[PDB]
């Protein structure tokens, strides 16, 4: 069935960069949109980025546009979210979501800054 596992998040120095890898399962990664979601302990969910199922167009939220790069690997069926410039604003748990909207949500991972 459709299942999403992601890794890469962890403690990093302020102003650094990160890449989060979200591995698909039970379906080719090409056939659905893939989004990313955020949520700090004191806030509700916050959409991050959204690749396009067919073709490789990407869109980002206002607070993060340009900073993050979302890519995809059709061979390994993995979706990568690259953080070029981090700041404490983004300190939160990260999720990767399938479908045009938030239909399925991954297990999750945590990222923090120092």
């Amino acid at each position: 069935q459709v299942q999403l596992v992601e890794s890469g998040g962890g403690l990093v120095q302020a102003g650094g960069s990160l890449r989060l890898s979200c591995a698909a399962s039970g379906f080719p990664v090409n056939m659905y949109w893939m989004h990313w979601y955020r949520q700090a302990p004191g806030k509700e969910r916050e959409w991050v980025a959204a690749i396009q199922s067919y073709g490789q167009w990407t869109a980002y939220a206002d607070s993060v546009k340009g900073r993050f790069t979302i890519s995809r690997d059709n061979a390994k069926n993995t979706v990568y979210l690259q953080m070029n410039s981090l700041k404490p604003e983004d300190t939160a748990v990260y999720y990767c979501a399938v479908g045009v909207g938030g239909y399925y949500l991954g297990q999750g991972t945590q990222v923090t800054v120092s």
């Binding site: 659905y32 869109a59 479908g99 909207g101």
Partner: protein, 517 residues
């Protein structure tokens, strides 16, 4: 007598147009673009594509109502643009319709192994058996569907038209049921599937135009309706109304499907609560998939029936004028319909679908219809301003040069704007000069008023495009951009096909042809 029977009716034209259009529409919706764009974005892309197709259909309807004739864009290009350019427009249109029908049949056959749902009946000696050549990869397939469709078309215009009407009405009813079910389910779940984070139109008009670029080829059915103009009792009234109602119904259906079923197909597949199963129990998507496959297959069959009824008409017009042997001209004394030309086109399409794969047939189809549209646009511009018959005495020549300049400028700026491989420094100059000459030509064209002899061409009355100075130019620009966007893969094949056409023309068609012999 040797005359086509004017037995068709406005409802029958609407049915033909809607079926032929909906087939390609469902072919696209099953394709890659459907999941490329969001639901609402896909719907507005279909809306813009429908607006552009209406820009083309206004010219089609005007030229068909004023001078109705089975030649379609061939006949029109032959009167305004002149001979030669017609033989290239008509030849390209023939290739386009033939390869559309062949691709539709080749796609239908494997999925139609059983009644519906893609099940297999395990036939013998009709299944796909690759040719065991030493280095040959062809995979011949059952192409009997083309033979049955050709037999239907050869059986008359009312009989084939009635069968097409039955199939397309069944398709439209199942599509309406399919939309009602989708809307009921969405309202039951409160449209929760459309809580899009990025929001609708996530890529802005940039995407809505990018999507509409590939969604434009879903409205390619009105040209067939024009091709069947001779069968209409009073084409002056029906043809424009029929074409309009067909592009309206198709646009509405596409937007509805795109917002209710397509934009939510991911939702029904991914969401763990599975509203389809929760609403219909264990069966769940299994019956929904069956219904969607039924609708798609009915639409594809309707378009397969519709497509092959244009080429015989084009061939009949060509032979009647003289660019093809009289073998294509004569009609059945009993059925009052091209039977020899229809049989030839049917056997050609059958062979093409038998040998070439669908993935190969789809790589050659798109170019003909765009050229037909561009030709018909230039034709309204030339028949409403400088009709080729009969304040300023130089008005005719200045108008002709102005039209030539708008035809050159559209090409220039549509190839500049669609050529990112060129460096920006000369790209800016070329686009600017093309644009300025286009603007100047448009200003001159508007300054010179419409020729009043336009009251004479064809028959008086009929439909006339809304904005003759700007709408046809917009249609030309759109079609030229679409043509240039098409990759070289389809262009090489259409070039060799047109070369074959020019060979036939120079060896026979120029030496023997009415109005030139």
């Amino acid at each position: 007598p040797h005359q086509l029977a004017k037995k068709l009716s406005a409802v029958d034209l609407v049915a033909i147009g809607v079926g032929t259009t909906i087939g390609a529409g469902v072919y696209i919706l099953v394709g890659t673009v459907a999941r490329e764009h969001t639901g609402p974005a896909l719907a507005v892309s279909f809306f813009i594509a429908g607006v552009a197709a209406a820009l083309s259909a206004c010219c089609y309807a005007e030229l068909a109502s004023r001078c109705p004739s089975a030649g379609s864009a061939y006949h029109y290009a032959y009167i305004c643009l002149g001979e030669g350019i017609a033989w290239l427009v008509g030849w390209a249109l023939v290739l386009d319709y033939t390869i559309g029908g062949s691709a539709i049949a080749r796609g239908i056959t494997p999925n139609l192994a059983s009644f519906f749902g893609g099940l297999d009946n395990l036939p013998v000696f009709l299944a796909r058996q690759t040719i065991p050549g030493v280095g040959i990869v062809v995979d011949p397939c059952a192409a009997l569907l083309i033979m049955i469709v050709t037999i239907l078309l050869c059986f008359g215009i009312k009989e084939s038209s009635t069968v097409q009407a039955i199939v397309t009405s069944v398709n439209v009813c199942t599509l309406v049921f399919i939309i009602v079910v989708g809307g009921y389910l969405a309202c039951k779940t409160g449209w929760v599937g459309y809580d899009l984070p990025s929001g609708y139109f996530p890529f802005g008009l940039n995407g809505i135009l990018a999507g509409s670029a590939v969604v434009f080829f879903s409205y390619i059915g009105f040209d067939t309706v024009t091709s069947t103009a001779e069968e209409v009792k009073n084409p002056q009234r029906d043809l424009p109304l029929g074409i309009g109602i067909a592009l309206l119904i198709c646009c509405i259906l596409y937007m509805l499907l795109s917002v209710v079923i397509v934009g939510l197909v991911p939702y029904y597949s991914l969401n763990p609560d599975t509203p389809i199963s929760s609403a219909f129990g264990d069966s769940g998507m299994q019956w929904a998939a069956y219904i969607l496959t039924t609708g798609a297959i009915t639409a594809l069959c309707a378009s397969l029936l519709g497509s092959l009824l244009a080429q015989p008409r084009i061939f009949m017009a060509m032979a009647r004028d003289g660019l093809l042997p009289a073998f294509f001209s004569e009609i059945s004394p009993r059925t009052q319909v091209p039977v020899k030309s229809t049989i030839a086109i049917g056997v050609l399409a059958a062979a093409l679908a038998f040998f070439m794969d669908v993935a190969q047939l789809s790589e050659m189809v798109s170019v003909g219809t765009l050229m037909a549209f561009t030709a018909v646009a230039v034709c309204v511009l030339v028949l409403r301003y400088v009709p080729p018959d009969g304040y300023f005495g130089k008005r005719r020549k200045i108008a002709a040069w102005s039209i030539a300049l708008v035809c050159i400028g559209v090409l220039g700026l549509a190839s500049a704007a669609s050529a990112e491989r060129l460096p920006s420094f000369p790209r800016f100059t070329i686009c600017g000069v093309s644009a300025v000459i286009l603007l100047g030509s448009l200003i001159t064209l508007g300054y010179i008023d419409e020729d009043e002899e336009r009251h004479n061409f064809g028959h008086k009355g009929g439909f006339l495009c809304p904005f003759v100075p700007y709408l046809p130019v917009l249609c030309i620009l759109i079609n030229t951009y679409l043509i240039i966007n098409i990759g070289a893969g389809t262009w090489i094949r259409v070039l060799i096909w047109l070369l074959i056409g020019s060979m036939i023309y120079i060896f026979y068609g120029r030496s023997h042809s009415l109005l030139n012999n």
